[PDB]
C-alpha cells in the first residue's frame, strides 16, 4: 500500500502519534516519506546482514525478528512480517518504543538528515 501524505497524516493522528514524546505530527509524516516513500511494503537489505521493514523502516538487529539476522535482540517483541501490513498499528506501536530510547527520533537516519530542524508543519498543512 502507498499512502497519500494527508491520508497518512490522518492515520498517524488516529494512532496517537501527534505530540508523542514531544514530537509533533509533521516529524512522523516527514520521516516516513524519506525512509520508505509512503510504501508499507518497503524492505531494505543492508550489507551488515540486517533488513529495515515497512513504512517506518524498522531494523531486524535491534527491534523486530526476521530469523535471518545474526545477533538479533527483538526489543519490540514482534515478527518483521507484521510491519509489512497495510494496517500501520504494529509499525506505530514499535515506533513509540524506539523513540523512547536515548536516540529519540535520530534513530531514523533520514529524519536526522532531512527533517530535523526544518518546517515539519508543512507536511500536515492543507489536510
Amino acid at each position: 500500500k502507498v499512502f497519500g501524505r494527508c491520508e497518512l497524516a490522518a492515520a498517524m493522528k488516529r494512532h496517537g502519534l501527534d505530540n508523542y514524546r514531544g514530537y509533533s505530527l509533521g516529524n512522523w509524516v516527514c520521516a516516513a516519506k524519506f525512509e520508505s516513500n509512503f510504501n508499507t511494503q518497503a524492505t531494505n537489505r543492508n550489507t551488515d546482514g540486517s533488513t529495515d521493514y515497512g513504512i517506518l523502516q524498522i531494523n531486524s538487529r535491534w527491534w523486530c525478528n526476521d530469523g535471518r539476522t545474526p545477533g538479533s535482540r527483538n526489543l519490540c517483541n514482534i515478527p518483521c512480517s507484521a510491519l509489512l501490513s497495510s494496517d500501520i498499528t504494529a509499525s506505530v506501536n514499535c515506533a513509540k518504543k524506539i523513540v523512547s530510547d536515548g536516540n529519540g527520533m535520530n534513530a531514523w537516519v533520514a529524519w536526522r538528515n532531512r527533517c530535523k530542524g526544518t518546517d515539519v508543519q508543512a507536511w500536515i498543512r492543507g489536510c
Partner: antibody
Amino acid sequence: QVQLVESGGGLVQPGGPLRLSCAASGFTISSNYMSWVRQAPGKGLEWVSAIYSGGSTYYADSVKGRFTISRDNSKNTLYLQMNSLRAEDTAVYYCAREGPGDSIVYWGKGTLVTVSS
Amino acid sequence: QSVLTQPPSVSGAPGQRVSISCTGRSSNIGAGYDVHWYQQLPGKAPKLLIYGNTNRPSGVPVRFSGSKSGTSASLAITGLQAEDEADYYCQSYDSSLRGSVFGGGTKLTVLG
C-alpha cells in the same frame, strides 16, 4: 538581530557547582533546537548537551548524570547546570542555535569556566 | 579511541589544491549520517562552511567543496590563499553514543 549572550562563567573549586545562562533576542528558544558546545584551551570542539523545540533533552557521556539543560520561556533564556566539576571541564562554553540536521547556524561569544583550587 | 579522525596538520602553496580527510565509524558516517564542516579563525567562534555533505551557505566561495562516501568524508580547497589559514573541523551524529560528534581538527598552513 539574532543575539546570544552567555553569563555565569568564572572560577570554581574541584567538585563544586556552576550554573550558566544564555539570553536570546531576535528569535524564540521554545521554537528552536538549542545546544551547548565546549572547547578547552588549545584543544578541539566538544558537544555537551541539546534541547529540542518539543522539549526533549540529550547529553554527552563525559557529562551524563552531572549536567542538566533547561529553558525559561518567560525570560527567553537557556541554562546549563554543572555539578561535581573537574579539571577536564575547564573550557570556553558556547551557546548554539541549530539549523537543519544538527548543523550550527549561530554561535554565542562563549564564557570561560576555570576549575582550579 | 577516536570517534571521527582528521590529520592534525596540512600544508599547501598559494594557488595549490589541498584536501582534508575525516574518517568515521559504522555508528556515525558509515551509519548514513551527514557530515558538516566548520572554519575557526583564531580568537573567534567557529562558522559553518559545508552543511549536508556538499552544500555551501551564502558567503562561502565555490573554491571550498565537500565529498562523502562509505565511512569517510573530505573537504577540498582549490586556489589556496592567505585568508584560508585556520582550524577545520568535521561533524556528524553517532547512534551508539547517542549524540552529535566532532573530529579532532586540522591546522591548515599556507606556505609561500
